[PDB]
Short mmCIF file of C-alpha atoms and ligand atoms in Angstrom, two decimals:
data_model
loop_
_atom_site.label_atom_id
_atom_site.label_comp_id
_atom_site.label_asym_id
_atom_site.label_seq_id
_atom_site.Cartn_x
_atom_site.Cartn_y
_atom_site.Cartn_z
CA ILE R 1 55.55 -86.51 -43.69
CA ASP R 2 54.24 -85.45 -47.08
CA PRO R 3 53.66 -81.66 -46.91
CA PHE R 4 50.43 -81.85 -48.91
CA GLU R 5 49.00 -84.57 -46.67
CA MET R 6 49.99 -82.45 -43.68
CA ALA R 7 48.13 -79.44 -45.11
CA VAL R 8 45.08 -81.59 -45.87
CA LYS R 9 45.18 -82.98 -42.32
CA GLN R 10 45.34 -79.45 -40.91
CA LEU R 11 42.31 -78.44 -42.99
CA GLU R 12 40.40 -81.54 -41.87
CA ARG R 13 41.27 -80.82 -38.23
CA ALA R 14 39.99 -77.26 -38.65
CA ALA R 15 36.81 -78.47 -40.40
CA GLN R 16 35.23 -79.90 -37.22
CA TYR R 17 34.99 -76.48 -35.52
CA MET R 18 32.67 -75.13 -38.24
CA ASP R 19 29.66 -76.19 -40.30
CA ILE R 20 31.12 -76.96 -43.73
CA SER R 21 29.51 -79.35 -46.20
CA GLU R 22 31.33 -82.52 -47.22
CA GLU R 23 31.36 -81.52 -50.90
CA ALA R 24 32.99 -78.17 -50.07
CA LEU R 25 35.62 -79.88 -47.91
CA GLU R 26 36.41 -82.33 -50.72
CA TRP R 27 36.66 -79.40 -53.14
CA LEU R 28 39.05 -77.52 -50.84
CA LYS R 29 41.10 -80.70 -50.29
CA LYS R 30 42.52 -80.62 -53.83
CA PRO R 31 44.06 -77.84 -55.97
CA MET R 32 41.84 -76.67 -58.81
CA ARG R 33 44.68 -76.41 -61.34
CA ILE R 34 48.23 -77.80 -61.27
CA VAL R 35 50.72 -76.98 -64.04
CA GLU R 36 54.08 -78.75 -64.41
CA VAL R 37 56.31 -77.61 -67.28
CA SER R 38 59.79 -78.10 -68.68
CA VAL R 39 61.94 -74.99 -68.32
CA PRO R 40 64.82 -75.14 -70.85
CA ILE R 41 67.68 -72.64 -70.76
CA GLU R 42 70.91 -72.25 -72.69
CA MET R 43 73.78 -72.48 -70.21
CA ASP R 44 76.88 -70.30 -70.44
CA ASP R 45 78.95 -73.13 -71.92
CA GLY R 46 76.41 -73.61 -74.70
CA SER R 47 74.43 -76.67 -73.66
CA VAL R 48 70.67 -76.71 -73.13
CA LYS R 49 69.49 -77.78 -69.67
CA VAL R 50 65.86 -78.63 -68.89
CA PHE R 51 64.43 -77.79 -65.46
CA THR R 52 61.13 -78.81 -63.87
CA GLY R 53 58.84 -75.92 -62.96
CA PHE R 54 55.58 -75.82 -61.04
CA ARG R 55 52.58 -73.52 -60.78
CA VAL R 56 49.74 -74.61 -58.50
CA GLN R 57 46.46 -72.67 -58.30
CA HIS R 58 44.64 -74.11 -55.29
CA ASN R 59 41.47 -72.01 -55.28
CA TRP R 60 40.38 -68.81 -57.01
CA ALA R 61 36.88 -68.42 -55.57
CA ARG R 62 37.74 -65.10 -53.89
CA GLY R 63 39.83 -63.73 -56.76
CA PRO R 64 43.07 -64.24 -58.68
CA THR R 65 45.52 -66.61 -57.02
CA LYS R 66 48.56 -65.22 -55.19
CA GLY R 67 51.80 -66.92 -54.20
CA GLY R 68 55.57 -66.79 -54.50
CA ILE R 69 58.04 -68.77 -56.60
CA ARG R 70 60.80 -70.66 -54.79
CA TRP R 71 63.96 -71.81 -56.58
CA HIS R 72 65.15 -74.78 -54.54
CA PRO R 73 66.90 -78.07 -55.43
CA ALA R 74 64.67 -79.92 -52.93
CA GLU R 75 61.45 -78.41 -54.31
CA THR R 76 58.70 -80.96 -54.95
CA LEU R 77 55.20 -80.73 -56.37
CA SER R 78 53.79 -81.80 -52.99
CA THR R 79 55.47 -78.89 -51.17
CA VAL R 80 54.22 -76.43 -53.79
CA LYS R 81 50.67 -77.78 -53.45
CA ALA R 82 50.82 -77.52 -49.65
CA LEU R 83 52.10 -73.95 -49.83
CA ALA R 84 49.40 -72.98 -52.35
CA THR R 85 46.74 -74.38 -50.01
CA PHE R 86 48.33 -72.38 -47.19
CA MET R 87 48.30 -69.21 -49.31
CA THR R 88 44.57 -69.67 -49.83
CA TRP R 89 43.93 -69.41 -46.08
CA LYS R 90 46.61 -66.71 -45.75
CA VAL R 91 44.90 -64.36 -48.20
CA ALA R 92 41.48 -65.33 -46.82
CA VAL R 93 42.37 -64.42 -43.22
CA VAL R 94 43.26 -60.78 -44.02
CA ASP R 95 40.19 -60.41 -46.30
CA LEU R 96 42.03 -60.06 -49.59
CA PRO R 97 40.25 -60.47 -52.96
CA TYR R 98 42.77 -63.22 -53.73
CA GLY R 99 43.01 -66.97 -54.05
CA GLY R 100 45.92 -69.24 -53.18
CA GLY R 101 48.77 -70.02 -55.55
CA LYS R 102 52.37 -71.22 -55.53
CA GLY R 103 55.21 -71.81 -57.97
CA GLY R 104 58.64 -73.37 -57.95
CA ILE R 105 61.60 -74.62 -59.99
CA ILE R 106 63.78 -77.57 -58.98
CA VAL R 107 67.15 -75.83 -59.32
CA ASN R 108 70.15 -74.75 -57.29
CA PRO R 109 70.55 -71.01 -58.06
CA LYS R 110 74.03 -71.03 -56.49
CA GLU R 111 75.36 -72.95 -59.52
CA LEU R 112 73.71 -70.44 -61.89
CA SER R 113 75.29 -67.27 -63.26
CA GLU R 114 73.41 -63.98 -63.57
CA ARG R 115 72.71 -64.55 -67.27
CA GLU R 116 71.63 -68.14 -66.58
CA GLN R 117 69.34 -66.91 -63.80
CA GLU R 118 67.75 -64.34 -66.12
CA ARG R 119 67.30 -67.02 -68.79
CA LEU R 120 65.63 -69.29 -66.22
CA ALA R 121 63.32 -66.49 -65.06
CA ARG R 122 62.30 -65.67 -68.64
CA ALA R 123 61.85 -69.32 -69.65
CA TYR R 124 59.62 -69.99 -66.63
CA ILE R 125 57.33 -67.15 -67.77
CA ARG R 126 57.43 -68.30 -71.41
CA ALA R 127 56.34 -71.75 -70.16
CA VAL R 128 53.62 -70.85 -67.62
CA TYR R 129 52.25 -67.79 -69.44
CA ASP R 130 48.80 -69.21 -70.29
CA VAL R 131 47.84 -69.76 -66.62
CA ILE R 132 49.13 -66.49 -65.12
CA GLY R 133 48.13 -62.86 -65.48
CA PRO R 134 47.23 -59.71 -63.54
CA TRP R 135 43.66 -61.01 -63.05
CA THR R 136 44.52 -64.73 -63.09
CA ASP R 137 47.62 -65.55 -61.03
CA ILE R 138 50.09 -63.11 -59.48
CA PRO R 139 53.47 -64.58 -58.43
CA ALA R 140 55.87 -63.02 -55.92
CA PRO R 141 59.40 -63.49 -54.49
CA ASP R 142 60.20 -66.50 -52.32
CA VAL R 143 63.16 -68.65 -51.18
CA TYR R 144 66.23 -67.93 -53.35
CA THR R 145 64.12 -65.49 -55.35
CA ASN R 146 64.22 -61.71 -55.25
CA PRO R 147 63.02 -58.42 -56.82
CA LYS R 148 65.64 -58.76 -59.58
CA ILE R 149 64.03 -62.00 -60.75
CA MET R 150 60.61 -60.33 -60.46
CA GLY R 151 61.80 -57.55 -62.76
CA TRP R 152 63.06 -60.09 -65.29
CA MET R 153 59.82 -62.11 -65.22
CA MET R 154 57.70 -58.96 -65.46
CA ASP R 155 59.68 -57.86 -68.51
CA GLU R 156 59.22 -61.27 -70.17
CA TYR R 157 55.48 -61.23 -69.43
CA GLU R 158 55.13 -57.72 -70.85
CA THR R 159 56.99 -58.77 -73.99
CA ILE R 160 54.60 -61.70 -74.48
CA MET R 161 51.47 -59.65 -73.64
CA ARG R 162 52.56 -56.90 -76.11
CA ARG R 163 51.74 -54.20 -73.52
CA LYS R 164 48.00 -54.73 -73.99
CA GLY R 165 46.98 -54.62 -70.33
CA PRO R 166 48.70 -53.60 -67.11
CA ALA R 167 51.77 -55.84 -67.18
CA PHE R 168 53.19 -54.41 -63.94
CA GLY R 169 50.42 -56.17 -62.00
CA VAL R 170 51.31 -59.66 -63.24
CA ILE R 171 53.93 -60.05 -60.48
CA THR R 172 54.67 -58.42 -57.12
CA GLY R 173 57.87 -57.72 -55.26
CA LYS R 174 59.28 -55.78 -58.23
CA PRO R 175 61.89 -53.02 -57.90
CA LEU R 176 60.68 -49.47 -57.28
CA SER R 177 61.68 -48.44 -60.81
CA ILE R 178 59.12 -50.78 -62.43
CA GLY R 179 55.88 -50.76 -60.48
CA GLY R 180 57.41 -51.49 -57.09
CA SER R 181 55.73 -50.55 -53.83
CA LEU R 182 57.04 -48.62 -50.84
CA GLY R 183 57.00 -50.33 -47.46
CA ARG R 184 57.59 -53.76 -49.02
CA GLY R 185 60.88 -54.45 -47.20
CA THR R 186 59.39 -54.11 -43.71
CA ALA R 187 55.94 -55.52 -44.53
CA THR R 188 56.10 -58.77 -42.55
CA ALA R 189 57.73 -57.15 -39.51
CA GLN R 190 55.32 -54.20 -39.59
CA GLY R 191 52.30 -56.49 -39.75
CA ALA R 192 53.71 -58.61 -36.93
CA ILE R 193 54.17 -55.46 -34.84
CA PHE R 194 50.57 -54.40 -35.53
CA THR R 195 49.34 -57.83 -34.44
CA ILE R 196 51.50 -57.69 -31.30
CA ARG R 197 50.00 -54.29 -30.45
CA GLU R 198 46.48 -55.66 -30.93
CA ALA R 199 47.27 -58.74 -28.81
CA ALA R 200 48.66 -56.60 -25.99
CA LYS R 201 45.54 -54.43 -26.19
CA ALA R 202 43.39 -57.56 -25.93
CA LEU R 203 45.36 -58.73 -22.88
CA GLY R 204 44.84 -55.28 -21.35
CA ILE R 205 48.50 -54.53 -20.60
CA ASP R 206 50.67 -51.46 -21.23
CA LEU R 207 53.78 -51.85 -23.38
CA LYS R 208 55.91 -49.05 -21.88
CA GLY R 209 59.12 -50.89 -21.04
CA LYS R 210 58.05 -54.52 -21.51
CA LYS R 211 60.67 -57.12 -22.44
CA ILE R 212 60.77 -58.68 -25.90
CA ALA R 213 63.10 -61.52 -26.95
CA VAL R 214 63.19 -61.65 -30.74
CA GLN R 215 64.58 -64.96 -32.02
CA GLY R 216 66.43 -64.63 -35.33
CA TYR R 217 67.96 -61.65 -37.13
CA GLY R 218 66.80 -61.89 -40.74
CA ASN R 219 64.64 -59.52 -42.74
CA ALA R 220 61.81 -60.61 -40.43
CA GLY R 221 63.64 -60.64 -37.09
CA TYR R 222 65.87 -57.58 -37.23
CA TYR R 223 63.06 -55.35 -38.46
CA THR R 224 60.68 -56.90 -35.92
CA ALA R 225 63.10 -55.94 -33.13
CA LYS R 226 63.73 -52.47 -34.59
CA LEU R 227 60.01 -51.66 -34.92
CA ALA R 228 59.24 -53.13 -31.49
CA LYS R 229 61.85 -50.73 -30.11
CA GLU R 230 60.86 -47.82 -32.35
CA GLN R 231 57.10 -47.12 -32.27
CA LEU R 232 55.93 -49.64 -29.65
CA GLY R 233 57.42 -48.32 -26.40
CA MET R 234 58.92 -51.76 -25.82
CA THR R 235 62.39 -52.78 -24.59
CA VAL R 236 64.48 -55.21 -26.64
CA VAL R 237 66.26 -57.42 -24.11
CA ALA R 238 67.32 -60.42 -26.22
CA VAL R 239 68.15 -61.14 -29.85
CA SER R 240 69.64 -64.25 -31.42
CA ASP R 241 70.92 -65.72 -34.68
CA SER R 242 71.95 -69.15 -35.96
CA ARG R 243 75.37 -68.93 -34.33
CA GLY R 244 74.10 -67.63 -30.99
CA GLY R 245 72.27 -64.92 -29.05
CA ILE R 246 72.69 -62.07 -26.56
CA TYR R 247 70.79 -60.72 -23.55
CA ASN R 248 70.72 -57.41 -21.68
CA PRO R 249 68.17 -56.47 -18.99
CA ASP R 250 69.26 -52.82 -19.20
CA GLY R 251 68.11 -52.61 -22.81
CA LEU R 252 69.47 -53.04 -26.33
CA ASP R 253 69.92 -51.12 -29.59
CA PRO R 254 68.90 -53.22 -32.63
CA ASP R 255 70.92 -51.13 -35.11
CA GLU R 256 74.23 -51.46 -33.25
CA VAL R 257 73.59 -55.20 -32.94
CA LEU R 258 72.87 -55.46 -36.69
CA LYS R 259 76.02 -53.62 -37.81
CA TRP R 260 78.14 -55.76 -35.48
CA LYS R 261 76.55 -58.90 -36.94
CA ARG R 262 77.19 -57.69 -40.50
CA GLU R 263 80.84 -56.82 -39.73
CA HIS R 264 81.51 -60.15 -37.98
CA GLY R 265 79.10 -62.55 -39.67
CA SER R 266 77.03 -63.12 -36.52
CA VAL R 267 75.38 -61.32 -33.62
CA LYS R 268 77.40 -63.57 -31.24
CA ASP R 269 79.82 -61.85 -28.85
CA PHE R 270 78.12 -58.47 -28.81
CA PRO R 271 80.19 -56.42 -26.32
CA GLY R 272 78.56 -55.85 -22.94
CA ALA R 273 76.04 -58.63 -23.58
CA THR R 274 76.02 -62.19 -22.30
CA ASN R 275 76.08 -64.83 -25.04
CA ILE R 276 73.33 -67.40 -24.54
CA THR R 277 72.07 -70.37 -26.53
CA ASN R 278 69.01 -70.00 -28.74
CA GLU R 279 67.32 -72.53 -26.46
CA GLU R 280 67.98 -70.28 -23.45
CA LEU R 281 66.50 -67.33 -25.34
CA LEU R 282 63.40 -69.34 -26.30
CA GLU R 283 62.76 -69.92 -22.57
CA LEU R 284 63.37 -66.40 -21.29
CA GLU R 285 61.28 -64.23 -18.96
CA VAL R 286 59.76 -61.77 -21.46
CA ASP R 287 56.34 -60.44 -22.46
CA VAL R 288 56.64 -61.02 -26.24
CA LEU R 289 58.44 -63.94 -27.89
CA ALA R 290 58.80 -63.47 -31.66
CA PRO R 291 60.57 -66.36 -33.44
CA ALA R 292 61.55 -65.21 -36.92
CA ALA R 293 64.37 -67.54 -37.95
CA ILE R 294 63.15 -71.08 -38.58
CA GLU R 295 60.08 -73.24 -38.02
CA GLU R 296 59.55 -75.79 -35.23
CA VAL R 297 61.59 -74.03 -32.57
CA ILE R 298 58.92 -74.84 -29.95
CA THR R 299 58.17 -78.50 -29.24
CA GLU R 300 56.41 -80.50 -26.50
CA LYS R 301 59.71 -81.23 -24.70
CA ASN R 302 60.24 -77.48 -24.18
CA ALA R 303 56.77 -75.87 -24.48
CA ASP R 304 56.36 -75.63 -20.69
CA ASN R 305 59.58 -73.60 -20.36
CA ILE R 306 58.19 -70.56 -22.20
CA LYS R 307 57.04 -67.70 -19.97
CA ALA R 308 56.24 -65.13 -22.67
CA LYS R 309 52.78 -63.61 -22.36
CA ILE R 310 52.56 -63.23 -26.16
CA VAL R 311 54.10 -65.56 -28.73
CA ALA R 312 54.18 -63.81 -32.11
CA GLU R 313 54.79 -66.41 -34.82
CA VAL R 314 56.65 -64.26 -37.32
CA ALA R 315 58.35 -67.38 -38.69
CA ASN R 316 56.36 -69.75 -40.91
CA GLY R 317 55.15 -72.23 -38.32
CA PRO R 318 57.52 -72.15 -35.33
CA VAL R 319 55.09 -73.90 -32.93
CA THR R 320 53.92 -77.54 -33.17
CA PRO R 321 50.35 -78.64 -32.38
CA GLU R 322 51.46 -80.44 -29.21
CA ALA R 323 53.28 -77.33 -28.03
CA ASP R 324 50.25 -75.37 -29.25
CA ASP R 325 47.89 -77.21 -26.92
CA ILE R 326 50.42 -77.11 -24.07
CA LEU R 327 50.96 -73.33 -24.38
CA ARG R 328 47.23 -72.61 -24.59
CA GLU R 329 46.84 -74.11 -21.11
CA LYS R 330 49.26 -71.67 -19.45
CA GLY R 331 47.27 -68.71 -20.76
CA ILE R 332 49.92 -67.60 -23.27
CA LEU R 333 48.28 -65.71 -26.13
CA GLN R 334 49.37 -67.07 -29.50
CA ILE R 335 49.35 -65.30 -32.87
CA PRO R 336 49.12 -67.86 -35.71
CA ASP R 337 51.85 -67.63 -38.33
CA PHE R 338 49.66 -66.96 -41.39
CA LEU R 339 48.02 -64.16 -39.41
CA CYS R 340 51.22 -62.71 -37.89
CA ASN R 341 53.32 -62.57 -41.09
CA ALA R 342 50.40 -61.67 -43.37
CA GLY R 343 51.83 -58.15 -43.72
CA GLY R 344 54.00 -59.32 -46.60
CA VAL R 345 51.08 -60.58 -48.66
CA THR R 346 48.98 -57.55 -47.67
CA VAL R 347 51.65 -55.16 -49.00
CA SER R 348 51.96 -57.38 -52.08
CA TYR R 349 48.23 -56.86 -52.58
CA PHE R 350 48.78 -53.11 -52.16
CA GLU R 351 51.48 -53.24 -54.86
CA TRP R 352 49.14 -55.11 -57.20
CA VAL R 353 46.38 -52.55 -56.54
CA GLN R 354 48.76 -49.69 -57.33
CA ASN R 355 49.86 -51.47 -60.51
CA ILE R 356 46.34 -52.09 -61.82
CA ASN R 357 45.24 -48.56 -60.90
CA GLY R 358 48.39 -47.05 -62.41
CA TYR R 359 48.64 -44.85 -59.29
CA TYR R 360 51.25 -45.28 -56.56
CA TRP R 361 50.93 -44.48 -52.86
CA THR R 362 53.37 -42.97 -50.36
CA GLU R 363 54.89 -44.80 -47.39
CA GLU R 364 52.40 -43.28 -44.93
CA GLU R 365 49.32 -44.39 -46.88
CA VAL R 366 50.71 -47.92 -47.25
CA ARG R 367 51.52 -48.07 -43.53
CA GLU R 368 48.05 -46.86 -42.51
CA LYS R 369 46.24 -49.25 -44.86
CA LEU R 370 48.34 -52.16 -43.58
CA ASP R 371 47.67 -51.08 -39.98
CA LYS R 372 43.91 -51.15 -40.54
CA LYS R 373 44.05 -54.48 -42.39
CA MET R 374 46.15 -56.21 -39.72
CA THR R 375 44.07 -54.79 -36.87
CA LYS R 376 40.81 -55.98 -38.43
CA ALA R 377 42.22 -59.43 -39.22
CA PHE R 378 43.60 -59.95 -35.72
CA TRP R 379 40.38 -58.82 -34.06
CA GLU R 380 38.31 -61.09 -36.30
CA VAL R 381 40.50 -64.08 -35.43
CA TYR R 382 40.59 -63.28 -31.70
CA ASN R 383 36.83 -62.78 -31.39
CA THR R 384 36.32 -66.16 -33.06
CA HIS R 385 38.86 -67.72 -30.68
CA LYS R 386 37.06 -66.30 -27.62
CA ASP R 387 33.49 -66.92 -28.88
CA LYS R 388 33.97 -70.57 -29.89
CA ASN R 389 36.50 -71.26 -27.08
CA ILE R 390 39.13 -72.64 -29.45
CA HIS R 391 42.84 -72.18 -30.15
CA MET R 392 43.85 -69.02 -32.04
CA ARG R 393 45.21 -71.10 -34.92
CA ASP R 394 41.91 -72.99 -35.16
CA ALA R 395 40.00 -69.69 -35.05
CA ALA R 396 42.11 -68.27 -37.88
CA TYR R 397 41.43 -71.42 -39.90
CA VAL R 398 37.71 -71.08 -39.15
CA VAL R 399 37.70 -67.47 -40.39
CA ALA R 400 39.70 -68.16 -43.57
CA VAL R 401 37.93 -71.37 -44.60
CA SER R 402 34.56 -69.77 -43.85
CA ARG R 403 35.39 -66.88 -46.20
CA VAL R 404 36.47 -69.26 -48.97
CA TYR R 405 33.38 -71.45 -48.38
CA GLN R 406 31.08 -68.44 -48.65
CA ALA R 407 32.73 -67.38 -51.91
CA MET R 408 32.42 -70.92 -53.28
CA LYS R 409 28.73 -71.09 -52.35
CA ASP R 410 28.02 -67.66 -53.85
CA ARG R 411 29.67 -68.67 -57.13
CA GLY R 412 27.48 -71.77 -57.17
CA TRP R 413 30.49 -74.09 -57.25
CA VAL R 414 28.93 -76.01 -54.35
CA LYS R 415 25.29 -76.01 -53.19
CA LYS R 416 25.18 -77.00 -49.47
N1 NDP P 1 60.60 -61.29 -43.29
C1 NDP P 1 59.86 -61.65 -44.32
O1 NDP P 1 59.81 -60.98 -45.35
C2 NDP P 1 59.09 -62.91 -44.23
C3 NDP P 1 59.20 -63.65 -43.09
N2 NDP P 1 58.64 -64.89 -43.03
C4 NDP P 1 59.29 -66.00 -42.29
O2 NDP P 1 60.30 -65.46 -41.48
C5 NDP P 1 61.38 -66.42 -41.34
C6 NDP P 1 62.70 -65.72 -41.55
O3 NDP P 1 62.66 -64.94 -42.77
P1 NDP P 1 63.61 -63.65 -42.83
O4 NDP P 1 64.05 -63.30 -41.45
O5 NDP P 1 62.95 -62.59 -43.64
O6 NDP P 1 64.86 -64.21 -43.66
P2 NDP P 1 66.04 -65.27 -43.39
O7 NDP P 1 65.45 -66.63 -43.21
O8 NDP P 1 67.06 -65.09 -44.46
O9 NDP P 1 66.62 -64.75 -41.99
C7 NDP P 1 66.44 -65.56 -40.80
C8 NDP P 1 67.71 -65.53 -40.00
O10 NDP P 1 67.52 -66.27 -38.77
C9 NDP P 1 68.73 -66.89 -38.39
N3 NDP P 1 68.51 -68.32 -38.22
C10 NDP P 1 68.39 -69.26 -39.21
N4 NDP P 1 68.22 -70.47 -38.75
C11 NDP P 1 68.23 -70.33 -37.37
C12 NDP P 1 68.09 -71.25 -36.32
N5 NDP P 1 67.90 -72.55 -36.51
N6 NDP P 1 68.14 -70.77 -35.06
C13 NDP P 1 68.33 -69.46 -34.88
N7 NDP P 1 68.48 -68.50 -35.79
C14 NDP P 1 68.42 -69.00 -37.03
C15 NDP P 1 69.78 -66.57 -39.46
O11 NDP P 1 70.62 -65.51 -39.03
P3 NDP P 1 72.13 -65.89 -39.44
O12 NDP P 1 72.08 -67.10 -40.35
O13 NDP P 1 72.67 -64.67 -40.15
O14 NDP P 1 72.87 -66.17 -38.15
C16 NDP P 1 68.92 -66.20 -40.66
O15 NDP P 1 69.56 -65.31 -41.56
C17 NDP P 1 61.07 -67.57 -42.30
O16 NDP P 1 60.56 -68.69 -41.60
C18 NDP P 1 60.03 -66.94 -43.23
O17 NDP P 1 59.15 -67.90 -43.80
C19 NDP P 1 57.46 -65.09 -43.71
C20 NDP P 1 57.25 -64.46 -44.84
C21 NDP P 1 58.19 -63.42 -45.30
O1 AKG P 2 53.67 -62.12 -51.15
C1 AKG P 2 53.01 -62.92 -51.78
O2 AKG P 2 52.07 -62.57 -52.62
C2 AKG P 2 53.19 -64.40 -51.68
C3 AKG P 2 54.54 -64.81 -51.11
C4 AKG P 2 54.45 -66.02 -50.21
O3 AKG P 2 54.56 -67.16 -50.64
C5 AKG P 2 54.21 -65.78 -48.71
O4 AKG P 2 54.09 -64.64 -48.27
O5 AKG P 2 54.13 -66.86 -47.99
N1 NH4 P 3 53.18 -62.81 -46.09
#
């Protein structure tokens, strides 16, 4: 279905668990500002190629909009709008002074050289300059988009701004040399681990030796497994990748699994471990299930097969609403995706704060601030879920949309 219509339907489904005026719902149903520009670059051969770029600012009631830029050949305006709407609730759920934004360029970066990529990054900034800024709209890395491109775009923005204000704060995810932040690489996994700790505390169970079956071995998944093993007292018993997955009741070492995967191209066939399908790992007797590879790994046809006490949605939407309602019945505690993986945007906010203050924090301060933020956000969502007797995803929507509504009413944008 159309991603934007799906996001609007999700917001409308959330709207009936809270008292929100019709005018506010109609306001939140459409992005406040959408910018579509031509992005011309000189290719290596010498020809000029024009690309289509997007920058959607859904809502800036709570502050400047935040959201990454994805370089994908299948990128559409509808997807960018849906993701900007999602970023609004994402930043609202962790109580950030941010709004929701999103950008994108319809391009295949694989067919682009380094110089062509830098030209594209600089031309995108030269085109969307008038609607971005450290207090207006702060982009970030996304799919096929990395700190190198952030450094290039930051440099272009500083050249246009003539170093008048803090140009480091215009974009996040930059390298450490130019206004980068420590703790950025493990932000999503660290936040997910904090939320898993809070969820286990809510369930009133001890984590000394409990099984965890991480699904996926990306930047999310590998670090999620490593931190679950490291400072959580847990026991990694199953990890998986696109090619396959492994299982060991005795225990597992995430680092030895990662180096084997890097030296062979996949985790599959880890010595001393039984190779199992990703489906078999999804339905495995564990306490924490943490999908961090791809969305929609849990469906109605297999939702009943999950026995995990906690399902930590590190991936961006791995559970469907049908499976959501099915899994709520069994008593399985669910952590919504835009609450579980909010550590990335929280550390991006920390980077922006350090940039605007001109003062940079150590790893320990970043970790502690993120710990407090994630703990507060999870407890706010869970108390709403228990008080209203609703699904954790619905409670997170109620919290985020309520925050944005309150900001909109206080600005006077809407009356009722
Ligand atoms: N970690 C982060 O910084 C962030 C995490 N997320 C979400 O986390 C998810 C993963 O991101 P991240 O791990 O960082 O990066 P990647 O998506 O690059 O890594 C995910 C890995 O999971 C494996 N995988 C891919 N598809 C499947 C599949 N169908 N079944 C099983 N395993 C699969 C692959 O391992 P391989 O191909 O090598 O076998 C892949 O490299 C995404 O949905 C993302 O939106 C959210 C925000 C940021
Ligand atoms: O980190 C950010 O500010 C936004 C990146 C993004 O799109 C996300 O985390 O979903
Ligand atoms: N994030």
